Specification:
It is classed as transferase. 2 copies of one chain form a homodimer. By secondary structure, chain A is an alpha/beta fold. Helix content of chain A is 38%, strand content 16%. The termini of chain A are far apart. Chains A and B meet through α1, α2, α4, α5 and α7 of A and α1, α3, α4, α7 and α8 of B. The structure holds a molecule of 2 linked components (PMP-HSA) (2 copies). A molecule of 2 linked components (PMP-HSA) is lined by residues 26-27, 84-86, 106-108, 145, 149, 173, 175, 199, 201, 207, 212, 308 of chain A.
């Protein structure tokens, strides 16, 4: 009884979001999952398959993932899935002795670390958003989203490479890979102490279905597979990811619109005089002085607009054109 | 090094007639499947959807049909498995009694949780043990893989101990009696249920928990925020809105179970008094190996355990061939 309250008080309280009319605070894709693809999924659905325990990493889903990665060195043994990239990170924290990340970073790193009671360390990035000096080695997992959350800034190659050389296991969280070009998947050829985490959540408009995947060494994937829940991804969720990848041209078009919308907003913000990051994610970040930031949030709240607030300022997710314009119009006049 | 305490993952090719995973024998209804996609909002697939959704809690509550539980007493997991997995991250030590669910050992090792396996007595009764606050005791009732039911007294004794009881009612629909009413006295209890067996929804991963508000609150802070997909929650909701179609299937399942139980006894086999959706046949290992091979020859798969085989109830035909097979054996 008493120790359970001790469990609480150690982790952040569970809360749910109350979405405003124009929600741009969770990096969700602006467009719904394509309706004809939902119908495709409905049609490929074998009602008899619902009653069975369905191989979470589906054999054909791995194939599609491989296909998508389009490398010449990967095999099914280098890939696995997660109930969202969230679970991959979560279980990864169960696997290593200590988790290491650098704020500003994906806020769930801290939450999940405290949730599972894992030992972790937060070393802040330089004022230049560069990876600080740190003492890590085999035993630690270093979580590096890249593009970074919520800055969306892209780290330099020697930066990851440095951590990589320390023998520490790097978990390159490529949650925003799709909205940026590069990917360190190829690095899997030189380093074994690395894992690339992806999701269907941002570019495939499937955040509600929870599908993440990991590309890494056979030894890691095997380890991961022994630690994760056996059936972590539903038959229907996998079906959504497979259909999704069968029509990637569709989402390539949406991603292009998102990026073209990101740069448009980034340009407009500079013109207005705001300090912003060189975000390669599906969002933009604005540096603001607390007091002027708070003033901006109150104004936006008055207009049913929700963005993500941060110590450094605000993170704005890219939405539909009329939402992006709205953000610009309210920022202009303020 | 990335050691793993040697315990791989894999699912060999399921034989044609698969009776080894306590899976419902019937497909999810075609029309409920239709209803699910009917209520499917495409715009909601792109957002992060409250896993324990509000309507899902209302439905569950309604299905539990009690006079005290409120929304605060219920939560959900990505399969009953996830609820077990997270609970093991919440307590100092996990205690369970073999023969018991094989995944308790697996998830504990996997989650690095301290655990103690104390075998049930020779009469399948909860053994005497030193447990109290800090400890969490997993008791499936009906038990897996025997299907036998533990007496209320048994559960209560562990409860008085002050240790937390994780009452695993994965097979409840086939038994008919829950100890969820115990939440009126003990706060150190959680009942766990699933949609995988009685609702032919094993593939969609939806489990749920009924416990004290303090426990629900701590559980909700340790689990993944969005552990149950939007569509999975829809599937559970429609299943509950048509709960009578599954009670019919379940009635059939139990008939079949009792029918096989009489025939096996008659044939001379020693069995447990299973109240789940399967039977348990005791077999002296060597001969068991014989059956397994034989069945392997007929494309038939059952589950093998140290004391025998657990055969899941399938369609009337599958059951018939099973009785016939055990007969000619
Ligand atoms: C007693 C018990 N508790 C929980 C579960 C989980 O059900 P879900 O996660 O689908 O909601 C189960 C399910 N049992 C099996 C078979 O068990 P065994 O043959 O390993 O002893 C199905 C299963 C689930 N995860 C792996 N296998 C049970 O029985
Ligand atoms: C860096 C990073 N990694 C993983 C994920 C999630 O992947 P999945 O959806 O497959 O689990 C995210 C997503 N970011 C979210 C917004 O973060 P914020 O609360 O700090 O603004 C969405 C989210 C998902 N769970 C909680 N929040 C990510 O950015």
């Amino acid at each position: 009884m008493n120790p359970l309250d001790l469990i609480a008080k150690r982790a952040y309280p569970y809360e749910t979001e109350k979405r405003d009319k124009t929600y741009l605070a969770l990096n969700e894709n602006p467009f719904p999952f394509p309706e004809d693809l939902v119908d495709e999924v409905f049609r490929r659905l074998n009602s008899d398959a619902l009653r069975i325990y369905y191989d979470s990493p589906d054999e054909e889903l791995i194939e599609k993932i491989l296909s998508y990665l389009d490398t010449d060195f990967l095999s099914k043994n280098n890939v696995s899935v997660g109930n969202g990239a969230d679970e991959i990170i979560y279980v990864m924290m169960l696997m290593f002795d200590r988790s290491v990340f650098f704020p500003p970073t994906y806020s769930c790193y801290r939450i999940f670390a405290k949730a599972v009671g894992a030992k972790f360390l937060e070393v802040p990035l330089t004022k230049d958003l560069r990876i600080p000096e740190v003492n890590v080695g085999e035993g630690d997992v270093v979580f590096i989203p890249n593009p970074n959350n919520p800055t969306g800034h892209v780290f330099e190659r020697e930066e990851i490479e440095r951590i990589l050389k320390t023998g520490a296991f790097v978990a390159l969280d490529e949650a925003y890979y799709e909205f940026h070009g590069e990917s360190y998947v190829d690095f899997l050829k030189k380093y074994e102490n690395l894992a690339v985490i992806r999701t269907f959540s941002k570019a495939f408009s499937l955040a509600a279905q929870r599908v993440g995947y990991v590309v890494a060494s056979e030894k890691f994937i095997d380890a991961y597979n022994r630690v994760r829940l056996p059936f972590n991804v539903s038959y229907v969720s996998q079906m959504f990811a497979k259909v999704a990848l069968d029509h990637r041209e569709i989402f390539e078009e949406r991603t292009k619109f998102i990026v073209e919308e990101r740069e448009r907003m980034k340009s407009a913000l500079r013109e207005m005089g705001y300090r912003i990051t060189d975000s390669r994610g599906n969002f933009v970040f604005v540096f603001m002085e607390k007091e002027e930031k708070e003033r901006l949030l109150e104004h936006l709240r008055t207009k049913n607009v929700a963005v993500r607030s941060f110590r450094e300022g605000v993170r704005i997710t890219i939405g539909k054109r009329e939402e992006n314009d709205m953000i610009l119009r309210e920022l202009e006049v303020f």
